[PDB]
Amino acid sequence: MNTVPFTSAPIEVTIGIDQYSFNVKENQPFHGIKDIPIGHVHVIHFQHADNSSMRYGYWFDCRMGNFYIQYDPKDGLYKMMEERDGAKFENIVHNFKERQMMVSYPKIDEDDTWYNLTEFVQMDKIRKIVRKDENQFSYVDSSMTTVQENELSDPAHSLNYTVINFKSREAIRPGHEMEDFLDKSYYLNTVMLQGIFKNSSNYFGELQFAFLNAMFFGNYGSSLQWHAMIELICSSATVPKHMLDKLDEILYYQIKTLPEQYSDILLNERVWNICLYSSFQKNSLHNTEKIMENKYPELL
Amino acid sequence: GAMNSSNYAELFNNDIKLFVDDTNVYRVTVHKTFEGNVATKAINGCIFTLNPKTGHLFLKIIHTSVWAGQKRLSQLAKWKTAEEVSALVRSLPKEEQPKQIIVTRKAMLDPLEVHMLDFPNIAIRPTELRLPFSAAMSIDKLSDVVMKATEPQMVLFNIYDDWLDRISSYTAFSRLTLLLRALKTNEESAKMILLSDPTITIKSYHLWPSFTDEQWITIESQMRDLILTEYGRKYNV
Numbered sequence: 001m002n003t004v005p006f007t008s009a010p011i012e013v014t015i016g017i018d019q020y021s022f023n024v025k026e027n028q029p030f031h032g033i034k035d036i037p038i039g040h041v042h043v044i045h046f047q048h049a050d051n052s053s054m055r056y057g058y059w060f061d062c063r064m065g066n067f068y069i070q071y072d073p074k075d076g077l078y079k080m081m082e083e084r085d086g087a088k089f090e091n092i093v094h095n096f097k098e099r100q101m102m103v104s105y106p107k108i109d110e111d112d113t114w115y116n117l118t119e120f121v122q123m124d125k126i127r128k129i130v131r132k133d134e135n136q137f138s139y140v141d142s143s144m145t146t147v148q149e150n151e152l153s154d155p156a157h158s159l160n161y162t163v164i165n166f167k168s169r170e171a172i173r174p175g176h177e178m179e180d181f182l183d184k185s186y187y188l189n190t191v192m193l194q195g196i197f198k199n200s201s202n203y204f205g206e207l208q209f210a211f212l213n214a215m216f217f218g219n220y221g222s223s224l225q226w227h228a229m230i231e232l233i234c235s236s237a238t239v240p241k242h243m244l245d246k247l248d249e250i251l252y253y254q255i256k257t258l259p260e261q262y263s264d265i266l267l268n269e270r271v272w273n274i275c276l277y278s279s280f281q282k283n284s285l286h287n288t289e290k291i292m293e294n295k296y297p298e299l300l
Numbered sequence: 301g302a303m304n305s306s307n308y309a310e311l312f313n314n315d316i317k318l319f320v321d322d323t324n325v326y327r328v329t330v331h332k333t334f335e336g337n338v339a340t341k342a343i344n345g346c347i348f349t350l351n352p353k354t355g356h357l358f359l360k361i362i363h364t365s366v367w368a369g370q371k372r373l374s375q376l377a378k379w380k381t382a383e384e385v386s387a388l389v390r391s392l393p394k395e396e397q398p399k400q401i402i403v404t405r406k407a408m409l410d411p412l413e414v415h416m417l418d419f420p421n422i423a424i425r426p427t428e429l430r431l432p433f434s435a436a437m438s439i440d441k442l443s444d445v446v447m448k449a450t451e452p453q454m455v456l457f458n459i460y461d462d463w464l465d466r467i468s469s470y471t472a473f474s475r476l477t478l479l480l481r482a483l484k485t486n487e488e489s490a491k492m493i494l495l496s497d498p499t500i501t502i503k504s505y506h507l508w509p510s511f512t513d514e515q516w517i518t519i520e521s522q523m524r525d526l527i528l529t530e531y532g533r534k535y536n537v
């Protein structure tokens with residue numbers, strides 16, 4: 001079990017770690033988060049009390065280095081840094097643990113929620129969507145735009161999700177205009193899976209990352225990408241059976257975790273009604289359709 | 301965006317544009333079968349592709365063989381329309397290609413936009429105008445070439461005859477839409493109006509009769525009366 005210490009907490013802030021959230025008061029004696037489960041990516045995220053503008057945070061994997069948070073009064077945010085001196089780091093953590101100044105990742109033993117939301121998410125793929133090669137962790141915020149959003153403006157601060165556009169030369173094959181538009185299997189299986197992502201695990205990893213950025217940061221371009229990647233599968237008549245069954249599990253846990261009060265802004269009525277009730281896969285997402293109908297019957 | 305009454309003079313500027321109407325592409329008669337079920341029989345159709353500035357009409361005849369063995373024909377017809385408009389644009393020299401294509405039915409937008417993905421500078425637009433182009437098959441010479449076709453064929457017409465020698469495109473389009481609206485509302489009476497006087501004839505190379513300027517005013521008034529007459533017969537006014 002790993003630890004992300006904090007130098008201090010000089011400004012009042014709501015801190016979230018994955019699906020958990022806690023509050024820290026201004027100058028409260030807080031020095032970080034312990035007992036973080038090894039084996040998954042994690043996200044540590046922030047919303048300042050005095051300016052809820054800009055949720056921001058950091059994706060990281062404690063297996064890749066020793067990371068800590070320190071507030072920067074010039075840039076006005078909590079920054080993640082890497083400590084290269086392992087013995088300094090271990091001694092800092094030990095002192096803060098002995099003084100009981102660290103909150104504990106409150107993982108219930110039965111609870112697989114975080115694994116289920118991050119099954120296919122890998123730090124190496126995050127670092128290619130979020131390009132800042134000198135750090136081992138990745139910063140994301142509410143306002144960052146996607147490569148596709150910018151085509152329709154700082155490229156270094158962008159989310160490089162794979163561009164999906166159903167009315168494009170990438171989407172449609174010369175002489176297959178009706179076929180490819182009404183049945184996206186070519187675009188899903190040849191262009192995206194075989195060509196770009198290489199396998200369904202990488203496709204699902206990007207889909208899962210997009211959802212988590214939409215949910216944790218209110219990142220609108222990430223919400224667009226998540227729905228586009230769902231629609232591309234649902235709109236394909238030919239999808240490997242293992243992919244459909246896995247997608248149903250992925251979406252079930254996403255819908256289960258979504259705050260009920262954010263559904264209006266995080267769920268696209270058109271995509272979901274199309275996917276569940278009109279698409280080729282309208283009958284292939286039993287678990288997702290059941291939770292959606294019981295939790296969000298208004299949207300439908 | 302969409303084409304409406306507010307931007308109506310745009311039709312007659314010097315930017316090449318085409319209207320595309322697909323309402324006569326897939327045409328059927330519905331009938332009973334020996335077993336008392338209902339079936340359709342397709343008849344030949346056409347795409348109505350019109351340059352409103354010049355009157356040039358590209359009438360692509362859709363022969364019933366294109367539907368043989370195909371499913372979901374009403375959907376296919378939109379994609380076949382877009383396929384054929386695409387092909388027409390590709391057959392034209394660059395300097396004759398349209399800068400905008402206006403579809404009369406919004407269901408043609410995605411099929412056409414998909415077919416012209418490799419032509420990004422041609423705008424595909426809907427219209428809020430209710431244009432009476434479905435009544436094209438009430439023009440006898442157009443209906444005749446469609447019904448006689450035994451294979452796919454493109455036939456070129458000027459839907460304005462020689463009117464542009466005497467009137468502007470705006471006035472010619474207004475006359476055309478009035479004639480077609482009348483033929484759509486009461487075809488028998490409209491044709492009666494157009495031919496009642498045996499001394500006014502249709503030239504071999506024309507679609508409409510050879511009316512003088514004064515006679516066109518009389519004809520246009522009679523068509524407006526017909527439209528108003530039918531409007532009163534319909535709504536009991």
Ligand SMILES: CCOC(=O)CCNCc1ccccc1
Nearest residue numbers: 017020021022023103104105106
């Ligand atoms: C009775 C209401 O309870 C809450 O609102 C729980 C808030 N978060 C718990 C937490 C605390 C510390 C780290 C991580 C999570």
Ligand SMILES: CCOC(=O)CCNCc1ccccc1
Nearest residue numbers: 169172173174414415416417418
């Ligand atoms: C002479 C027709 O040759 C073509 O290739 C038709 C192109 N149709 C639109 C399109 C173009 C390119 C990719 C996808 C769609």
